[PDB]
Structures are given as structure tokens and as C-alpha cells.
Design a protein around this nucleic acid. Sequence first.
RNA 1: GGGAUACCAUGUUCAGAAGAACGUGGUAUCUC
Length: 90
Amino acid sequence: GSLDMNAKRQLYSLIGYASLRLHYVTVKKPTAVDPNSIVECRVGDGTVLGTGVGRNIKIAGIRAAENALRDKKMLDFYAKQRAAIPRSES
RNA sequence: GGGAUACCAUGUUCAGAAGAACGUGGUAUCUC
């Protein structure tokens, strides 16, 4: 299918190059009165592949990955980019 | 007695392209 295992595979394997600067930030810190946690699938400090939320947070973590592999246009877009990438980059 | 997050610690597992990440021991809060 297309989740967790398949996700991590997409992110790193499919779009896991050098300098990409992945950035899955965790927000909404879970609690014993509302575990619910949302993830921020972003990279480069200005790119959001998607977002995810879940009760046991994992669904949030996963949903996060599944979120990044949900934007083929963005995914592939990076493929080319990764290949292009000009000079003078930080 | 079931289940969920988390803390200290430790590792296994998913996969089976690739590699990521979750698990596990116990204390506790909540909850059923």
C-alpha cells in the first residue's frame, strides 16, 4: 500500500537526497487528557509536504509521511530539482 | 483485568526497491 513503511521509503528512498533538509516537526504535544498529536511534514525550513494528526500520535507520524508522498507533483518536482540544483547553495 | 500518552533505560521490527521507524521493560496520569 502507501503508509509508514511505504512512506519512509518514499520520503528518503524516493526523495531522500543530500541537503534536502527534511523537517518533520511535532506539534500539539500529546497528553493523558487528549493524546492527539499533529505532525508537520516540512523541509528546507519553508516547504510543507503535508500534515498529519492521530490519537496515538503514530497515525500522526505516519500520516505525516503519507502526507509527503501525497504530492506527486511536489515529489517528482524534487526529483528534477535534486538533479538541477545550481551552485552557491547553503 | 483491557487500552493510551509519557519519563528512565534498551532493542527489535517493519520492509523486502529503499530505507525509516517503531518496539520492549517498569513507574505514573488518564481512561475503560
